[PDB]
Structure 1
Amino acid sequence: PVDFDNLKTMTYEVTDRVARITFNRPEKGNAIVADTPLELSALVERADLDPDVHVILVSGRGEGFCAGFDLPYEGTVLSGKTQALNHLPDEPWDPMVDYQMMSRFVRGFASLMHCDKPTVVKIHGYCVAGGTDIALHADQVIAAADAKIGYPPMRVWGVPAAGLWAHRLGDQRAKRLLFTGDCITGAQAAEWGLAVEAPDPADLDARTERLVERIAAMPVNQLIMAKLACNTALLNQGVATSQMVSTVFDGIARHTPEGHAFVATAREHGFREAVRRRDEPMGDHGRRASDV
């Protein structure tokens, strides 16, 4: 059970009518850990139920919003032992054991889509890999013009479990990114309709505060109705099915020969080196742009 007085991965503060959910592992690029979806969904529910909250603002401390997945469950399918056993390469694995695990990460992230009140994600720096599985669920994404946004583990070791790229970008632009693992800038993300605006990084915080203040100025009842109305169209696109099959695919990506070889490199040399070997050949390692 989440303890609001001892949160592990993020902070919560209500200022006037804005509930601020702020990731708090800056030293690790706010990388996603087992408590991340639990804390996110609990805090989103708390904001939903607080009559003084009109809007939820999600952001991260440090150099970027979120770098993706980090490299009481005993006797459950989610136990560390069960999951580790299910990642051995030389024995048959169980994709449904994997599904039960990864679908619950996505379930927690999807709180930003299915909650009653408006959600805003502010992206500075980078929002890559699993970070996008969080961000794309938000109602409004506002990104620094120079932010790096995409899903590089398409190259090896993941398929976006949230399954939202086609819903947020359309077929052609989603395929452009998922067939390459390439990232786009925040500026491109606004041009492509992934973000609602892309202020220069110096103006990001001010434009974000401006956006959330305008939303918070609206009555809660009006906001909830607008969201229900818009979500009828969104969910009718088959979002639930995209997320299910993508979560299955993500488990497959982590268990193919390619996926195991990436993990073997990370085990031997660290995740940083594994990521370097993945991206340096493509010219976009680090904060580098992919020139889409």
Structure 2
Amino acid sequence: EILLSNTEERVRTLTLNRPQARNALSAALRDRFFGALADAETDDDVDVVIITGADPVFCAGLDLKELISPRWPALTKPVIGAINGAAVTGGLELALYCDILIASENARFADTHARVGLLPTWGLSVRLPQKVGIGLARRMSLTGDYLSAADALRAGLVTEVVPHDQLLGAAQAVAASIVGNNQNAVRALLASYHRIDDAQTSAGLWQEAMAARQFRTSGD
């Protein structure tokens, strides 16, 4: 129940499914999600992964009630994020890991790390400015204010915005187009893109990790 999984036309959709807890990532949901991605890489029945959330929220972030190392695994199959509502903090980081984002008109995005007195460890501080721009990333992180779907489209955080009821259809359409191409090339090319990106982001991700340790050390 806490994660749904379904495979149609070689596209597997993973759905975060604790809607009454606004899809917060508990220890259980983290293990199940990150495990489900790893399995999709090795499963010859799947070419593309779509990730989404049960409405009205995509992901509210880590289950802070309950409470952090990075776990997104190495994939050569593409992951499309179908963002159905608020993506906040660690939930925003999940969106940021996706290769391709599409958004409902209901999508919005926020970083509350500075608001709740924490620092990111899942790449926000690298990938946010990479994907929305330096100033917008800094405005988002320091104010903690929401970025709308329309503005996310403008800044290049998502590739498409559609009416709520069309969201999954749109993600499936992009996935069908991928599925219809040569998959040896899809994966070789995507693996190459990840390598080239990783080469630029490693140093920055190391610094994100060190900044978080130092912040935790002095607060303790």
Normalised to the residue count of structure 2, the TM-score between the two structures is 0.87
- Corresponding residue to 2:106 among 146, 149, 152: 146
Q: Distance in 2 between matches of 1:13 and 1:254?
A: 39
What residue in structure 2 maps to residue 19 of structure 1? Answer: 12
List aligned pairs for 1:89-100, cutoff 5 A. none
- Corresponding residue to 1:229 among 192, 203, 220: 192
Q: Is the 8 A contact 2:84 2:107 kept in 1?
A: yes
Q: Which amino acid aligns with 2:144?
A: G
In the TM superposition, residue 116 of structure 1 has moved relative to its aligned partner by: 1.3
Q: Is the 8 A contact 1:142 1:195 kept in 2?
A: yes
Q: Is the 8 A contact 1:57 1:122 kept in 2?
A: yes
Instruction: Write the deviation string for residues 117-160 of structure 1: whole angstroms up to 9, x where unpaired.
Output: 00011111211111012111010111113311021232232223
Q: Which amino acid aligns with 1:200?
A: P
Q: Distance in 2 between matches of 1:192 and 1:145?
A: 15
List aligned pairs for 1:229-268, cutoff 5 A. 229-237=192-200, 239-250=201-212
For structure 2, the 5+ residue unaligned runs are: none
Q: Is the 8 A contact 1:68 1:129 kept in 2?
A: yes
What residue in structure 2 maps to residue 123 of structure 1? Answer: 83
List aligned pairs for 1:125-274, cutoff 5 A. 125-163=85-123, 164-237=127-200, 239-250=201-212
Normalised to the residue count of structure 1, the TM-score between the two structures is 0.67
Question: Are the structure 2 counterparts of residues 256 and 199 from structure 1 closer, same or farther at C-alpha, using a change threshold of 3 Å?
Answer: farther
In the TM superposition, residue 219 of structure 1 has moved relative to its aligned partner by: 2.8
Q: Please report the RMSD computed on the Cα atoms of aligned residues, expressed in angstroms.
A: 2.4
List aligned pairs for 1:49-88, cutoff 5 A. 49-71=42-64
Q: Percent identity?
A: 26
Q: Which has the larger radius of gyration?
A: 1
Which deviates the most, 194-203 or 54-63?
194-203
Q: Is the 8 A contact 1:152 1:183 kept in 2?
A: no
- Corresponding residue to 2:39 among 31, 42, 46: 46
What residue in structure 2 maps to residue 268 of structure 1? Answer: none
Q: How many residues align?
A: 216
